[PDB]
Each structure stands twice: as C-alpha cells, then as structure tokens.
Amino acid sequence: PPQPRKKRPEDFKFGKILGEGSFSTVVLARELATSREYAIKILEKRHIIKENKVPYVTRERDVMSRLDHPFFVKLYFTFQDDEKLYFGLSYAKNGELLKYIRKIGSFDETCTRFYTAEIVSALEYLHGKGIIHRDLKPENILLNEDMHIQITDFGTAKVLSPESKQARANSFVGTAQYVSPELLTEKSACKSSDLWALGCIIYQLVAGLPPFRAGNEGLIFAKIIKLEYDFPEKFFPKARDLVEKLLVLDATKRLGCEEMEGYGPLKAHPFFESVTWENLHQQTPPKLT
Ligand SMILES: Nc1ncnc2c1ncn2[C@@H]1O[C@H](COP(=O)(O)OP(=O)(O)OP(=O)(O)O)[C@@H](O)[C@H]1O
Numbered sequence: 382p383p384q385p386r387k388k389r390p391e392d393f394k395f396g397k398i399l400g401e402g403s404f405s406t407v408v409l410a411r412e413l414a415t416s417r418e419y420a421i422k423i424l425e426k427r428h429i430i431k432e433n434k435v436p437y438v439t440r441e442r443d444v445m446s447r448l449d450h451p452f453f454v455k456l457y458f459t460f461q462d463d464e465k466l467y468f469g470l471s472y473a474k475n476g477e478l479l480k481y482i483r484k485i486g487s488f489d490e491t492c493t494r495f496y497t498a499e500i501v502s503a504l505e506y507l508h509g510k511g512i513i514h515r516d517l518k519p520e521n522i523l524l525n526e527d528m529h530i531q532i533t534d535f536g537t538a539k540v541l542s543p544e545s546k547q548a549r550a551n552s553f554v555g556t557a558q559y560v561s562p563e564l565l566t567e568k569s570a571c572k573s574s575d576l577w578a579l580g581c582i583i584y585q586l587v588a589g590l591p592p593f594r595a596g597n598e599g600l601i602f603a604k605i606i607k608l609e610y611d612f613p614e615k616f617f618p619k620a621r622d623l624v625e626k627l628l629v630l631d632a633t634k635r636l637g638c639e640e641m642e643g644y645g646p647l648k649a650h651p652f653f654e655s656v657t658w659e660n661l662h663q664q665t666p667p668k669l670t
C-alpha cells in the first residue's frame with residue numbers, strides 16, 4: 382500500500398546534538414505535525430562518497446528496516462535532501478549502557494542478570510533472522526526512558542544469505558576489546574562472534590572493565606588469541622561459569638551457538654534460573670543503585 386509522505390527537514394524542529402560519530406551526527410528533533418521526538422542521524426553525501434562510506438550507510442538502512450523487536454533502536458523513516466541523508470530513529474533518552482558501568486563501577490547480580498537476559502533475548506531475535514551484529518559493546522547498547530535496552534549501530538552488521546546457508550562473513554569490522562578470535566585468525570565472523578562479545582560484556586558489567594585490555598589494539602589481539610584473562614575476586618560464581626562458556630576460542634563450542642543447539646541451552650544456564658524470558662520488555666528493570 383502507500384506510505385506516509387516522505388518527510389523533509391522543514392518538518393522538524395531540531396534541538397541538541399545527542400552525539401557525533403566519525404561521519405554522522407545525531408540530533409534530537411521534534412516533528413512539528415505530531416510533536417513526536419526522534420533521534421535523527423544525519424550524514425553528508427559528499428563526505429560519505431569521498432570517504433568510501435556509502436556501503437556502510439546503505440547497510441545500516443537495509444539492516445535496520447528488517448528489525449521489529451523492542452530491544453533494538455527503531456528506524457521509523459528515512460529521507461534526503463541535496464546535501465544530506467537522514468535516518469529517523471527512536472530516541473533512547475537514557476543514553477549508553479557504558480555510562481552506567483562507569484558511574485556505578487560494578488553491577489550487582491540482579492542487574493547483571495536482568496541486562497544480560499535482555500541482551501541474550503535481543504541476540505536470539507537477531508540471529509533468528511540470520512543477522513550478525515559484529516560490533517556489540519556497551520557503547521552500542523542504549524537505554525530507553527524505562528531503562529530497557531535499545532541496541533544500535535547496524536552499519537557493520539551482516540545479513541547472512543539464507544539461499545546459500547551462509548554461516549561466515551568476510552568483512553573485517555568491530556572494536557578490538559570485543560572482537561572474536563575467529564575474526565583475527567580466520568578473517569571471518571559468524572553468529573557465534575556476537576556470543577564472544579556477550580561474554581566480554583557480562584564480564585565488564587561485573588568487573589568494571591572488559592576482559593582483554595591493553596593500551597593498544599595489537600596487544601589486545603594477542604591476549605584474545607591466547608585467551609589471556611582472569612576473573613577478579615567476588616565475581617558471581619554462576620556468572621563466571623557463564624562467561625567461561627562464552628569466551629571459548631572455538632566458535633562452535635560457545636553456549637548459544639548453532640553447533641551447541643542454540644538459545645535454549647543458553648537461556649537454561651543456572652545464572653538465569655530466576656529469569657522470566659517471555660515478557661522482559663514489560664518487566665520493570667531493577668534499579669542500578
Ligand atoms: N537513537 C539514539 N537515541 C539517543 N542517542 C543516540 C541514538 N543513536 C545514537 N545516539 C548517540 O549518538 C552518538 C553518535 O552516534 P553515531 O551512530 O552518529 O556515531 P558513533 O556510533 O558514536 O561513532 P562512530 O560511527 O564513529 O563509531 C552515539 O554514540 C550515541 O551516544
């Protein structure tokens with residue numbers, strides 16, 4: 382059927398800058414005809430063409446248009462003018478998960494469990510659609526007004542082809558602290574690469590820093606490939622067990638991966654015994670302090 386007319390910049394009142402990326406800016410905007418607030422991500426055509434970023438921008442639009450789940454930032458609309466491309470996104474009022482990790486230092490067990498469960502639920506949805514995120518990290522996990530997660534940053538994501546039963550993707554993308562050993566060694570990622578990142582994030586929620594850390598990327602890569610990390614004292618024992626089952630060098634042996642029979646066994650892990658998986662997005666999140 383028809384859709385709402387394409388929006389234009391003059392349909393909005395723009396407000397504050399919410400953040401700046403290397404080739405994008407996100408601005409808070411109110412749509413004049415509805416009074417709705419959106420986070421509008423704006424890119425300059427000349428700049429993305431000159432810097433060979435067109436594929437990333439197209440990837441982000443294509444992947445986000447496929448998503449329809451409460452734990453992901455929503456793409457409501459797109460438009461362009463002579464100079465710019467615009468994405469109309471849901472506004473995650475409470476910002477990045479990373480901010481809360483730093484402010485609090487270490488999440489308690491109830492908060493670690495709840496936020497971990499939301500991320501697992503999101504990944505189950507994404508993987509079920511054959512999509513690999515490839516850059517999962519706390520900066521890319523936003524929080525809405527109700528303190529539920531909103532995963533974002535899909536320009537480096539990959540839709541695996543169902544037609545060829547594709548399992549592996551060949552683009553070198555991600556963030557050093559969270560990149561999987563298979564990407565470093567075999568130069569390909571798979572859905573299980575996101576489960577490695579999950580393990581790093583759970584560790585970081587409890588420990589305050591991700592497990593493989595160093596002052597530069599090459600040093601981090603060396604630690605990843607050797608599984609060189611340790612747990613701090615008082616790390617919740619069931620969480621430690623879970624992390625140890627995700628931070629596994631062989632991507633086919635990570636809990637939650639297809640070769641380990643999927644999300645059922647992961648959701649059944651003892652760390653999640655008290656979780657009600659069915660309706661997490663309607664549960665009230667535990668207070669962080
Ligand atoms: N939907 C949103 N709601 C609220 N804030 C957002 C939203 N999307 C992005 N932001 C904020 O804007 C920042 C800039 O996002 P953008 O995607 O332009 O770049 P980036 O991912 O931070 O940087 P780079 O692209 O260089 O990695 C984000 O880091 C985030 O803090």
Ligand SMILES: Cc1cccc(C)c1OCCSc1nc2ccccc2n1CC(=O)O
Pocket residue numbers: 426427429430435438439442459460461466467468
């Ligand atoms: C992708 C692209 C990059 C640079 C310059 C141009 C001319 C260009 O084509 C836009 C054609 S359609 C389009 N592709 C998008 C990719 C991200 C966000 C908005 C987007 N829109 C405009 C739209 O969807 O209405």
